A paper describes a structure:
While the homogeneous complexes failed to crystallize thus far despite the best of our efforts, we were successful in determining the structure of L. pneumophila CdgS9Output bound to P. fluorescens LapG (see details in ‘Materials and methods’). The crystallized complex consists of two CdgS9 output domain molecules that adopt a similar parallel dimer conformation as in the apo-CdgS9Output structure. The output domain dimer is bound to one LapG molecule at a lateral docking site, with an interaction surface of 1290 Å2 (with a calculated ΔGint = −16.3 kcal/mol; PISA [Krissinel and Henrick, 2007]) and involving both molecules of the CdgS9Output dimer to a similar extent. As predicted by the biochemical analysis, the conserved tryptophan residue (W126) is the major anchor point on CdgS9 as it inserts into a hydrophobic pocket at the bottom of LapG. While there are contributions from a limited number of hydrogen bonds and a water-mediated interaction, the interface appears to be dominated by hydrophobic contacts and shape-complementarity of the interacting elements. The resulting complex is asymmetric with regard to the output domain dimer, manifested by a 5 Å tilt and vertical offset of one PAS domain fold relative to the other. The central helices α1 are pushed closer together—a movement permitted by smaller residues at the interface (S48 and S52), a perpendicular-to-parallel stacking transition of one of the F33–F34 residue pairs, and the relocation of R75 from the dimer interface to a more surface-exposed position. The net result is a transition from a four-helix bundle with poor shape complementarity with LapG to a two-helix bundle and an overall shape that is able to accommodate LapG. First, we identified a rare di-calcium binding motif in the N-terminal lobe of P. fluorescens LapG, which is in contrast to the single calcium ion bound at the same site in the L. pneumophila LapG structure.
LapD is a c-di-GMP receptor that translates changes in the concentration of this cytosolic second messenger into cell-surface events via an inside-out signaling mechanism that ultimately controls cell adhesion. Specifically, c-di-GMP-bound LapD engages the periplasmic protease LapG through its Per-Arnt-Sim (PAS)-like domain, preventing it from cleaving the cell surface-bound large adhesin LapA, a protein mediating cell adhesion to multiple substrates. In contrast, c-di-GMP-unbound LapD adopts an autoinhibited conformation and loses its affinity for LapG. To address these shortcomings, we report here two structures, that of the output domain of a LapD ortholog from L. pneumophila, also known and referred to here as CdgS9, and that of LapG in complex with the same output domain.
Author numbering:
A (entry chain E): 51 to 213, 230 to 247
B (entry chain B), C (entry chain A): 22 to 152
């Protein structure tokens, strides 16, 4: 399931306009995916989590998209260089899947962020089904065992799937951007 | 070839949408009971988002015992592409199913779930046969 | 006086049932996630039964974190007055929709909700009109 970044850049330019500095960030993403396939799974988690936390500024959807809730594709996140809680999680999810992390190990997790006192979303990694998960977050850079994140309270978790709803709309946008399905 | 009347197709969707809206309202009402007791708006907000983002509902609403709205998730208005005269032939009063949120035997509020008929309208409109 | 073809009705009805199975899986999975309810088998059994009796599913299944089947509710086995030639025109496989059962951050299992295409078979057989 290889990704054609030249065609993706061409299609995204038509969908969103000239990508500007977003093209360089998409180039940096392509480099990450090209050079991190053979490292350990724990290293994949670190470099992907750190890459998007550094490449994206946290800005609310109402400011960036003029919509209360708007789920970015990874290309949209890198085009804008910005997003909010679920945008980080989605971008890290698809990157880790492309790098070979099994889908059974990755969950989209709705949480309560205690310090911000608001609904929040993170990506969780389960080394085995009964394991304590690691939290890939947009609020901080370290990846910690979930129970060590005393500032978070989990609400519900989802295994990402699909082929209209929020996640399906993301997949629809990625198909238009040129990603294989 | 075999057909079914438009009215019979309509009846199936009314049954299935009301059942689905009621089932989510009841099961979500159970899940919301402790965060509502605790007045934990972010957790209630997070639960409704989890169900709403994954489903196809028009709206989910959480009220307290006095009817004051605590959580409201709504679908942005949708464009269609389906004439109103046809919708008038098949439309049914707006579906909204409720379930009480309980603190033991004491009623603590209500959750209200409304289905989204836009799939029903589109399926019947695209494949309607006049005979 | 509008009709829809039986083949198109079959597609709509199956899609609506499969969507309902997903929504029920999500809401039931969330409710079983609360207060370690999924470890209280008598309470979880009562909860799954309530959802099954009100729904139209072929089966609801609960597995724990090790994959052991803990709850399995299935349609009581009733025989069909529907001829095979008619079923062959409309037959479709039953899909199983899932949602996770959680204890906070720890995974506790999965709830599996299966659609029932035989319900569509019976509805179309009752309302089939030949033209
Ligand atoms: Ca958002
Ligand atoms: Ca967003």
């Amino acid at each position: 399931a290889d990704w054609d970044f030249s065609a993706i850049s061409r299609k995204a330019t038509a969908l969103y306009g000239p990508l500007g500095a977003g093209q360089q960030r998409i180039d940096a993403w392509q480099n990450l995916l090209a050079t991190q396939k053979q490292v350990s799974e724990m290293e994949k988690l670190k470099v992907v989590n750190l890459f998007f936390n550094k490449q994206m500024r946290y800005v609310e959807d109402i400011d960036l998209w003029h919509e209360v809730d708007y789920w970015e594709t990874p290309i949209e996140a890198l085009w804008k260089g910005a997003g909010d809680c679920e945008d980080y999680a989605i971008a890290k999810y698809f990157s880790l899947r492309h790098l070979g992390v099994a889908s059974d190990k990755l969950r989209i997790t709705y949480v309560k962020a205690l310090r911000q006192n608001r609904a929040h979303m993170v990506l969780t990694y389960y080394s085995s089904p009964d394991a304590m998960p690691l939290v890939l977050d947009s609020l901080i850079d370290p990846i910690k065992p979930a129970a060590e994140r005393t500032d978070l309270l989990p609400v519900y978790s989802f295994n990402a799937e699909g082929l209209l709803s929020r996640w399906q709309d993301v997949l629809k946008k990625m198909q238009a951007e040129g990603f294989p399905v | 070839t075999y057909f079914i009347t438009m009215n019979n197709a309509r009846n199936f969707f009314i049954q299935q949408l009301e059942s689905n809206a009621q089932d989510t309202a009841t099961s979500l009402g159970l899940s919301l009971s402790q965060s509502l007791i605790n007045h934990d708006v972010p957790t209630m907000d997070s639960m409704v988002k989890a169900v709403f983002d994954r489903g196809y509902f028009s709206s989910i609403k959480v009220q307290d015992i006095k009817g004051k709205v605590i959580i409201l998730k709504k679908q942005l208005p949708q464009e269609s592409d389906i004439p109103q005269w046809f919708v008038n032939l098949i439309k049914w009063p707006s579906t909204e199913k409720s379930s009480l949120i309980m603190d033991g035997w004491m009623q603590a509020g209500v959750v209200l779930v409304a289905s989204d008929p836009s799939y029903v309208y589109a399926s019947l409109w695209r494949n309607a046969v006049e005979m």
